[PDB]
Design a protein around this ligand. Structure first.
Ligand code: BCB
Ligand code: BCB
Ligand code: BCB
Ligand code: BCB
Ligand SMILES: C/C=C1/c2cc3[nH]c4c(c3C)C(=O)[C@H](C(=O)OC)c4c3nc(cc4[nH]c(cc(n2)[C@@H]1C)c(C(C)=O)c4C)[C@@H](C)[C@@H]3CCC(=O)OC/C=C(\C)CCC[C@H](C)CCC[C@H](C)CCCC(C)C
Ligand SMILES: C/C=C1/c2cc3[nH]c4c(c3C)C(=O)[C@H](C(=O)OC)c4c3nc(cc4[nH]c(cc(n2)[C@@H]1C)c(C(C)=O)c4C)[C@@H](C)[C@@H]3CCC(=O)OC/C=C(\C)CCC[C@H](C)CCC[C@H](C)CCCC(C)C
Ligand code: HEM
Ligand code: HEM
Ligand code: HEM
Ligand code: HEM
Ligand SMILES: CC(C)=CCC/C(C)=C/C=C/C(C)=C/C=C/C(C)=C/C=C\C=C(C)\C=C\C=C(/C)CC/C=C(\C)CCCC(C)C
Ligand SMILES: COC1=C(OC)C(=O)C(C/C=C(\C)CCC=C(C)C)=C(C)C1=O
Ligand SMILES: [Fe+2]
Lengths: 258, 323, 273, 332
């Protein structure tokens, strides 16, 4: 006789193979796929003249809401109805649902396409001990540039069009992670600063090179409300602005490379 | 290009920060120091490190295992120092060559192996507590400890539980660089080809799947570092353009998408299951399945192919074959 | 049909080739030119697979197998049933793989994000080529590539390994495996850390960036940091194949003996022989 | 530490299974040339006159031969085993019937063994047969022999380093690794498998589920048997200059039929042949050899797969003299 044999041709390991499969799909469909739906649901669409139903499937696919209790106060509950209320300067290019939208104004400033931001909190991100996290070195005076690296304060910023567009005034550091995230510059010929995230910068020894946008367009980089502080949502506006440059800085850029 | 995703162009230096535990804060030993070259691709500060009881325990047991192994290995090149350094990889500490069953084997035939085996276990246990405690001290969930637990269980499975289940210490994993490798083939060969073990298939799936997943995740986050994708905790409690864009990349590509939190769950699940699938595979082997290829054959799963050279009968079964 | 935040991103532009022609979505899927090509090869490849599978002796899924030609056919075209199908399906696979890759670039472009994902996807494509194309080229026959079957491709991996006595002593394999194991461990670590900070238990506060750093500094004396663990992860993952590629290529074109013997270069230094 | 393209490759299994040989062409050419030193047959002589059983005094084995035939054989025997030494390696210079020197009586037993292989082990050696040259290669001590311990170098015409010397205990793991194609397998498949018929090479089960009564506790064969069988196969592979897939479809090492090549059945007989030679000819010769021949346990040097094959799948690439020296068998 055999270890494992259960019956006619059924044995243990064979049953376990079925159980294994079951456990995997349960976790995947019933658990992981629902956790995937805590942001962005329920799906949106146009609508109908007459509709008065909860639509079962929209209940079924969602998980039960969970609530984060936030380190410095408050809660967030997800999933929740985060509607996109704010208006967009885009026009449908074809009639069919799958068709892309076209911006109707200046997408950089209208913040559409690559230039969009999330409706993040207008709250200043905070360190673990409650201070503002991303702040200029004028403020983060206990921080410095590691010896060996370029100090970019003083250097010119050179936009995609070859033109010098300002002068790096300061670096903003993340004092939770000890990591520079933005350069601040005096915009040339404007009475303003602009931040620019360090991922959009080529730091040379003698100039910072910014390819995303032309010198003109630094003018309308999003403005901060304070000078030594930046909110989660502002970070999004500032970043998104240059990301929008990559598609929209010039007319060629939206069209086929080849 | 975003050079930040390649390396840190301008490193920031600043004061050493300490998040305080619910205990042990006075066991963090060492002065932080900063490597500039490390700073280019990671955080520059190395140290301090928490000491603590569980950790000291782990260190102590672990080092005892190593002494037992290194001492038997040293014996194998007859305490010759140069031949030790030369043949290191080939040197091993083995289980019962002989069938003692579950009899405690003589020191020379697997006695030392069960010893090192035992101390290594206490070492893994002590370390687990460290990994679990530190989370709790810092006010964290214990997801890491539980992912670790599956890994330790797997070791226990190939180390103890399988050998116990079938009733032989001879079946355990030797210590040594080439020796633990040779075992993989010996074990596969004895059990009729581990390619045909369904759970080995699952494991590899989840293993490959971790490669898939960490390449796709790591690359997704670098691709949105411009928008602060790297700050994953706060992208969770307050969704930003980073993870919206990341989510849409994956929706437009594959048709469905995760969130910035749930992808770390898929990640965690896939990692966990490499070890969990492996463990089941082992628990089933010997206990209930002797020949995995034959088992597949029994259940209709096996490929078969035409002869290319002529089909060869077993001489052994020839009428009037010797033995 | 749209995520709640999706409409503002669905703008025209970003295509590599084709422009406005294929710039649109079917459902959630972006199409684009390469979406169009990707689908053509999938259809081709899958049709071939079915026709081939029908000519053969089985429709049990684990058992079906579509194998390359005999070695004698060299690098030439083989009869459809004797590896001709296999050659066709391989061109279809490559076309689909690479179209999938380029389509990701157009989606990246449109979203204004780094091209990193399509890039990272090139590594698995590259390893496919090493096994199916480059190595058979170096050896001189398409017959050295692996068959297309769920279980049969494991029998090829098995025999290929034992052709070199113990494939485990292959130094390229050793490196590859190491990266496979470290990567799986790191993904567990990384998922776990983020979950643990965002989900502490009870009604505890979500923790912080500074906790993530503290936890590993305590546990192991070092914390690489948040951006840098994603870089590491992509690296450890990619080096599974980038190092493995070497150990594969070497076996045959560059080393014909068992892999254990290779280590002779160490064992047999005369200073200690 | 690498070998440049191209590689010679063959197919030994259905297409897409990656079975076949992988040869470096220079290595094959090098063995080809060495085995090419096989001396050609001495021109045939005619059977004029009286069987040497009448003609000579002390001819036991080859007594049926006419004189010219006999001396033809003696000249061949001399060019295969003791060319540098000439006839007197075995003969008293002044008495040809003298058994005074041990090579004589060993050569007598070797003539019997050699006729045995060619008559009774045709399952292995077929119509290619062996001659004294197959093992001896022109020297009285054959270059590749096995003691009851591992020894180095494998070709005993090479002179040891310190560590190789069997007396050096710290060189053991290497002595053993180099016998098992460089693996760390802590077993010697010669003394385990080939010196005799005590052990069973097959270790793999032939039922999907564990049969009750052979599958727990001391009922079980220890896993170490699987390492031994693996080591024996590393050894065979390197002995024949080949890889597993010359003989097995690794899908199932244990199956035959379509899952095994013809060469595996032949190898099966070779294992059987080798044990026989060892138990009934070679090991007994410790009675008849100088102590200088014998190993640390008082064993005579014995045969494995290498002794003949010397790194080629067919010894001397299939060369035969079987038609040329029928004295040597097959003995009708
Ligand atoms: C050199 C070594 C190789 C290897 C070694 C290997 C081993 C040793 C094992 C597998 C296993 C598997 N392999 Mg193989 N493999 C496979 C696909 C597969 C799956 C059948 C399975 C699970 C893999 C996995 O989940 O990864 C992670 C990816 C994930 C989780 C995403 C989902 C992918 C999905 C499961 C793939 C399913 C593909 C289908 C067969 C569809 C085929 C095309 C259809 C549409 C016509 C593909 C598609 C390719 C190609 C195109 O290169 C490939 C190449 C290779 N594999 C190499 C030749 N593979 C395991 C198995 O169980 O074998 C049956 C296993 O044991
Ligand atoms: C010829 C032999 C074969 C073989 C034999 C084999 C065996 C014998 C086993 C596997 C198993 C597995 N194999 Mg298979 N295999 C695999 C892949 C895998 C893994 C997915 C999985 C092992 C899980 C693991 O991560 O262990 C690595 C992870 C480990 C070891 C966990 C460590 C955790 C621990 C807490 C760390 C401790 C470290 C400390 C510092 C300790 C130090 C203390 C000091 C004192 C000593 C691939 C991808 C392939 C292909 C491509 O060919 C393959 C081919 C084959 N395998 C051959 C068919 N394989 C296992 C399995 O899944 O069984 C079903 C299994 O047991
Ligand atoms: C079922 C399958 C098995 C298997 C299969 C296997 C194969 C097939 C191969 C190996 C290989 C290897 N194995 Mg084996 N293995 C090993 C160990 C080893 C290594 C010798 C090597 C590479 C290890 C590696 O890269 O992992 C991953 C490494 C990790 C996770 C490193 C951790 C990094 C870390 C988090 C950083 C720590 C930071 C610092 C402490 C900071 C310092 C600053 C402070 C102090 C202030 C151990 C210790 C164990 C167990 C469980 O105890 C084990 C079990 C097994 N292996 C199983 C039996 N193993 C390879 C080899 O080389 O063979 C010779 C190989 O090819
Ligand atoms: C007996 C033989 C053995 C063997 C033979 C072997 C060979 C011959 C090779 C490896 C290789 C590899 N092995 Mg070994 N191996 C490994 C692990 C590994 C991998 C790390 C590595 C790379 C696998 C690969 O090429 O995937 C390839 C996967 C590909 C190409 C996937 C392509 C995906 C494609 C881009 C997309 C596919 C799309 C699908 C069709 C999509 C489906 C759509 C659906 C889902 C909607 C472990 C951990 C172990 C253990 C535990 O023992 C092991 C044992 C062994 N290996 C045995 C000893 N191994 C390879 C290597 O690099 O070694 C140097 C290699 O060539
Ligand atoms: C699928 C998921 C997987 C997975 C998961 C996870 N894996 C984890 C965790 C998770 C989640 C943890 O949280 C835990 C950890 O902490 O991470 C930071 C850990 C770990 N995984 C390690 C190794 C690893 N993971 C492997 C595999 C997988 N992991 C699989 C793949 C492999 C494989 C692949 O082979 C390896 C080798 C260690 C780094 C670490 C344990 C250390 C230990 O257990 O301590 C044991 C303690 C000792 C040995 C102390 C002795 C050491 C000293 C130096 C000895 C000195 C002796 C000397 C002779 C004298 C000195 C005298 C003195 C006075 C001067
Ligand atoms: C080191 C880094 C790794 C890595 C990385 C990344 N991986 C990625 C990405 C990144 C970064 C993506 O961006 C891309 C993606 O979109 O993710 C969701 C992707 C993807 N990784 C898949 C499978 C996968 N990744 C594996 C391995 C690694 N990935 C390694 C580990 C394995 C292994 C290990 O076996 C598998 C099977 C697909 C799901 C997906 C491509 C979809 C496609 O290509 O659609 C196009 C094609 C199809 C839908 C079908 C095409 C059918 C052809 C015509 C005919 C079939 C022929 C085929 C040869 C037959 C095989 C039969 C037999 C062997 C059974
Ligand atoms: C070298 C060419 C050579 C000569 C010459 C030679 C001759 C020879 C004769 C004539 C006999 C018969 C003598 C008698 O009456 O017994 C004979 C017998 C045997 N020989 Fe011889 N021999 C020469 C060389 C060698 C060599 C190199 C060896 C040892 C390897 C050898 C051995 C023997 C043996 C044994 C016998 C007896 C054979 C038998 O049938 O019993 N000879 N030899
Ligand atoms: C062929 C008929 C043949 C002869 C003749 C022959 C002779 C021979 C002699 C003289 C010795 C003793 C050598 C010594 O000086 O000690 C001897 C020893 C061994 N032989 Fe031999 N041999 C003949 C044939 C064969 C064949 C076909 C094989 C291999 C299967 C073979 C092997 C050996 C081995 C091993 C020894 C023992 C070690 C040793 O004494 O040198 N011989 N042979
Ligand atoms: C190559 C390194 C190699 C491996 C691996 C291998 C393994 C192996 C096993 C596991 C068995 C056991 C089968 C069982 O339990 O029923 C086995 C058996 C035989 N082998 Fe083998 N084998 C390898 C290589 C080779 C080569 C190159 C050949 C042919 C020259 C060969 C032959 C055989 C034979 C014969 C047996 C049966 C042993 C007996 O019945 O006594 N193998 N092999
Ligand atoms: C040791 C147990 C051993 C093995 C293994 C082995 C295998 C083997 C094979 C696979 C063949 C067939 C090769 C082919 O291509 O068909 C083969 C052929 C011959 N062998 Fe052998 N062999 C082993 C041992 C021995 C020993 C000890 C001797 C010499 C006394 C020997 C001889 C031969 C001969 C002769 C042949 C060739 C037959 C032919 O057709 O040419 N083998 N061996
Ligand atoms: C005692 C009884 C009756 C009951 C208890 C049974 C018991 C629990 C037994 C346990 C057995 C176990 C757990 C066995 C497991 C064995 C395994 C999986 C071993 C596998 C791999 C080992 C390998 C690769 C390592 C071998 C050793 C070496 C390479 C040398 C070690 C060297 C060092 C770590 C150097 C450290 C240097 C430092 C500076 C980093
Ligand atoms: C945001 O997420 C993460 C980090 O940021 C704070 C980390 O610092 C680390 C820790 C990194 C370490 C210890 C590097 C050592 C190497 C390996 C292979 C684990 C992990 C796991 C992580 O997930
Ligand atoms: Fe992450």
């Amino acid at each position: 006789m055999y270890h494992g044999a259960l019956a006619q041709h059924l044995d243990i390991a064979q049953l376990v193979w079925y159980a294994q499969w079951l456990v995997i799909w349960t976790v995947v469909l019933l658990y992981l796929r629902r956790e995937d739906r805590r942001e962005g649901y329920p799906l949106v669409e146009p609508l109908g003249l007459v509709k008065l139903a909860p639509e079962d499937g929209q209940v079924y696919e969602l998980p039960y809401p969970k609530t984060f209790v936030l380190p410095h106060g408050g809660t967030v509950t997800v999933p929740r109805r985060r509607p996109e209320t704010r208006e967009l300067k885009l026009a449908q290019t074809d009639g069919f649902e799958g068709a892309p939208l076209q911006p109707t104004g200046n997408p950089l400033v209208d913040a559409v396409g690559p230039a969009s931001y999330a409706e993040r909190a207008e709250v200043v991100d905070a360190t673990v001990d409650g201070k503002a996290k991303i702040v200029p070195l004028r403020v983060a005076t206990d921080f410095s540039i590691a010896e060996g690296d370029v100090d970019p304060r003083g250097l010119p910023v050179v936009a995609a069009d070859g033109v010098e567009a300002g002068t790096v005034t300061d670096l903003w550091v993340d004092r939770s992670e000890h990591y520079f995230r933005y350069l601040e510059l005096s915009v040339a010929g404007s009475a303003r600063t602009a931040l620019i995230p360090l991922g959009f910068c080529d730091v040379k020894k003698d100039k910072i090179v910014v390819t995303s946008i032309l010198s003109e367009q630094f003018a309308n980089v999003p403005r901060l409300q304070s000078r030594d502080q930046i909110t989660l949502r502002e970070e999004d506006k500032v970043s998104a602005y240059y990301a929008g440059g990559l598609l929209y800085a010039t007319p060629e850029r939206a069209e086929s490379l080849l | 290009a975003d050079y930040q995703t390649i390396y840190t162009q301008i490193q920031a230096r600043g004061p050493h920060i300490t998040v305080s535990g619910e205990w042990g804060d006075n066991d963090r030993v060492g002065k932080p120091f900063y490597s500039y070259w490390l700073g280019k691709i990671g955080d520059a500060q190395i140290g301090p490190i928490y000491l603590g009881a569980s950790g000291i325990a782990a260190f102590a047991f672990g080092s005892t295992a190593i002494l037992i192994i290194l001492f038997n290995m040293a014996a194998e090149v007859h305490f010759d120092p140069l031949q030790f350094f030369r043949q290191f990889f080939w040197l091993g500490l083995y289980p019962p060559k002989a069938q003692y069953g579950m009899g405690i084997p003589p020191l020379h035939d697997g006695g030392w192996w069960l010893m090192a085996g035992l101390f290594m276990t206490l070492s893994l246990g002590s370390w687990w507590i460290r990994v679990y405690s530190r989370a709790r001290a810092l006010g964290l969930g214990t997801h890491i400890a539980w992912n670790f637990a599956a890994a330790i269980f797997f070791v226990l499975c190939i180390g103890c539980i399988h050998p116990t289940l079938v009733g032989s210490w001879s079946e355990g994993v030797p210590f040594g660089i080439w020796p633990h490798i040779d075992w993989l083939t010996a074990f596969s060969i004895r059990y009729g080809n581990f390619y045909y073990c369904p759970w080995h298939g699952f494991s590899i799936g989840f293993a490959y799947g971790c490669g898939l997943l960490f390449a796709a995740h790591g690359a997704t986050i670098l691709a949105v570092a411009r928008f602060g994708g790297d700050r994953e905790i706060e992208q969770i409690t307050d969704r930003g353009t980073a993870v919206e864009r990341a989510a849409l990349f994956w929706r437009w590509t594959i048709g469905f998408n995760a969130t910035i939190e749930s992808v770390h769950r898929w990640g965690w699940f896939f990692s966990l299951m490499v070890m969990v699938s492996a463990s089941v595979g082992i628990l089933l082997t010997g206990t209930f399945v002797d020949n995995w290829y034959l088992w597949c054959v029994k259940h209709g799963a096996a490929p078969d192919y035409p002869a290319y050279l002529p089909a060869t009968p077993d001489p052994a079964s020839l009428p009037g074959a010797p033995k | 049909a749209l995520l709640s935040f999706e409409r503002k991103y669905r703008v025209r532009g970003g295509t590599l080739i084709g422009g406005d022609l294929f710039d649109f979505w079917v459902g959630p899927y972006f199409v684009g030119f390469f979406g169009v090509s990707a689908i053509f090869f999938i259809f081709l490849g899958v049709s071939l697979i079915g026709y081939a599978a029908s000519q053969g002796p089985t429709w049990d899924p684990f058992a079906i197998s579509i194998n390359p030609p005999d070695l004698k056919y060299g690098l030439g075209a083989a009869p459809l049933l004797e590896g001709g199908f296999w050659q066709a399906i391989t061109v279809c696979a490559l076309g689909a793989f690479i179209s999938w890759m380029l389509r990701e670039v157009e989606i990246s472009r449109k979203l204004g994000i780094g091209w990193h994902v399509p890039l990272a996807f090139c590594v698995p494509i590259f390893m496919f080529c090493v096994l199916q194309v480059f190595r058979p080229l170096l050896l001189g026959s398409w017959g050295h590539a692996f068959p297309y079957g769920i279980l049969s491709h494991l029998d090829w991996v098995n025999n290929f390994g034992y052709q070199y006595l113990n494939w485990h002593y292959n130094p390229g394999h050793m490196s590859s495996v190491s990266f496979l194991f470290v990567n799986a461990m790191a993904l567990g670590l990384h998922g776990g850390l983020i979950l643990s900070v965002a989900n502490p238990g009870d009604g505890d506060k979500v923790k912080t960036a500074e906790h993530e750093n503290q936890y590993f500094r305590d546990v192991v004396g070092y914390s690489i940091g948040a951006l840098s663990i994603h870089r590491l992860g992509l690296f450890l993952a990619s080096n599974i194949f980038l190092t493995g590629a070497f150990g594969t290529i070497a076996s045959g074109p560059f080393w014909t003996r068992g892999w254990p013997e290779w280590w002779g270069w160490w064992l047999d230094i005369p200073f200690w022989s | 530490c690498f070998e440049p393209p191209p590689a010679t490759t063959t197919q030994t299994g259905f297409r897409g299974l990656s079975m076949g040989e992988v040869l470096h062409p220079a290595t094959v050419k090098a063995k080809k040339e060495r085995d090419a030193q096989y001396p050609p047959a001495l021109a045939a002589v005619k059977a004029e006159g009286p069987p040497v059983s009448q003609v000579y005094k002390n001819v036991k084995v080859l007594g049926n031969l006419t004189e010219a035939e006999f001396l033809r054989t003696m000249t061949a025997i001399t060019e295969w085993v003791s060319p540098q030494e000439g006839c007197t390696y075995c003969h008293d210079e002044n008495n040809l019937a003298s058994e005074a020197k041990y090579p004589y009586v060993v050569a007598r037993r070797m003539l019997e063994m050699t006729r045995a292989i060619n008559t009774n082990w045709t399952q292995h050696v077929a119509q290619t047969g062996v001659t004294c040259y197959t093992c001896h290669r022109g020297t009285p001590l054959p270059p590749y022999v096995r003691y009851l311990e591992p020894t180095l170098p494998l070709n005993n015409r090479e002179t040891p380093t310190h560590v190789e010397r069997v007396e050096t205990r710290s060189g053991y793991v290497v002595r053993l690794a180099k016998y098992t194609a460089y693996s760390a397998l802590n077993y010697d498949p010669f003394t385990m498998f080939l010196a005799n018929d005590k052990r069973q090479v097959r270790v793999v089960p032939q039922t999907a589920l564990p049969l009750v009564g052979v599958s727990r506790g001391k009922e079980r064969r220890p896993l170490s048997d699987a390492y031994a069988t693996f080591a024996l196969m590393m050894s065979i592979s390197d002995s024949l200059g080949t890889n597993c897939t010359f003989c097995h479809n690794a899908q199932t090492f244990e199956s035959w039929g379509k899952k095994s090549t013809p060469q595996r059945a032949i190898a099966w007989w070779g294992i059987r042949m080798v044990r026989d030679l060892n138990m009934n000819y070679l090991a007994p010769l410790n009675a008849s050899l100088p102590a200088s021949r014998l190993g640390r346990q008082g064993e005579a040097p014995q045969a494995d797969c290498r002794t003949c094959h010397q790194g080629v799948t067919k010894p001397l690439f299939g060369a035969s003299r079987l038609k040329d020296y029928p004295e040597l068998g097959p003995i009708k």
